[PDB]
Symmetry: D2
Subunit: 31 residues, 4 copies
């Protein structure tokens, strides 16, 4: 999880910065 957790976290941050919408997030939460 270290490397995995770090990858997930940095990916999420980049995604948000790229403009990932609240709608995408909400959809993700429903999965």
């Amino acid at each position: 999880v270290s490397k995995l957790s770090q990858l997930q976290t940095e990916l999420m941050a980049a995604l948000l910065e790229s403009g990932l919408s609240k709608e995408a997030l909400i959809q993700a939460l429903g999965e």
Copy 2:
């Protein structure tokens, strides 16, 4: 956005499959 949207979507899907938690998602929603 095509390529960008497609990248975001596929990245999210992979993230979820890797075990991205509800807690991470919720944190993301608060940003």
Copy 3:
């Protein structure tokens, strides 16, 4: 034999390539 981390790496690279990642970027990465 394939961990969650490896699988995520694989999928991420695939998505990167599809998005148009260039050979140059790949070359630079190799130089790291």
Copy 4:
């Protein structure tokens, strides 16, 4: 000059490398 897509590509590659992406994986990607 750097689009959101390019920037995301850059950050994703950086994160991939940090996670331990191998040279072999990079070689294979180049062969695509």
